[PDB]
């Protein structure tokens, strides 16, 4: 966002864009990491870790299995903040 302001949504979308090597603009909330954004097994392992670091949160491996979309990653991060 302007002058370094950024929402949880924008921060998830930037981390996903960086990790999966796609335009921030192709990272919409409806997107599947695997089916839409071409994440392989290693991409997903590293993406979990990049989200954990950005948001200073622990995503347990079995929660991480269910986070199949950009929307789920936003809702998980928002829930472990509020």
Swiss-Prot record:
Single GO biological process annotation from the record: lipid A biosynthetic process
Cited NCBIfam families: acyl_carrier, PRK00982.1-2, PRK00982.1-3, PRK00982.1-4, PRK00982.1-5
Gene3D superfamilies recorded: ACP-like
Modifications made to the protein after synthesis: 4'-phosphopantetheine is transferred from CoA to a specific serine of apo-ACP by AcpS. This modification is essential for activity because fatty acids are bound in thioester linkage to the sulfhydryl of the prosthetic group.
Sample GO molecular function, one term: acyl binding
SUPFAM superfamilies associated with the record: ACP-like (SSF47336)
Pfam families xref list: PP-binding
One Gene Ontology term, aspect cellular component: membrane
Main location group: cytoplasm
Family, similarity comment: Belongs to the acyl carrier protein (ACP) family.
Protein name: Acyl carrier protein
Residues carrying O-(pantetheine 4'-phosphoryl)serine: 41
Subcellular location(s) per record: Cytoplasm
UniProt keyword Zinc present: no
Domain Carrier: 6-81
Role summary: Carrier of the growing fatty acid chain in fatty acid biosynthesis.
Name of the encoding gene: acpP
Signal peptide: none
Involved pathway(s): Lipid metabolism; fatty acid biosynthesis
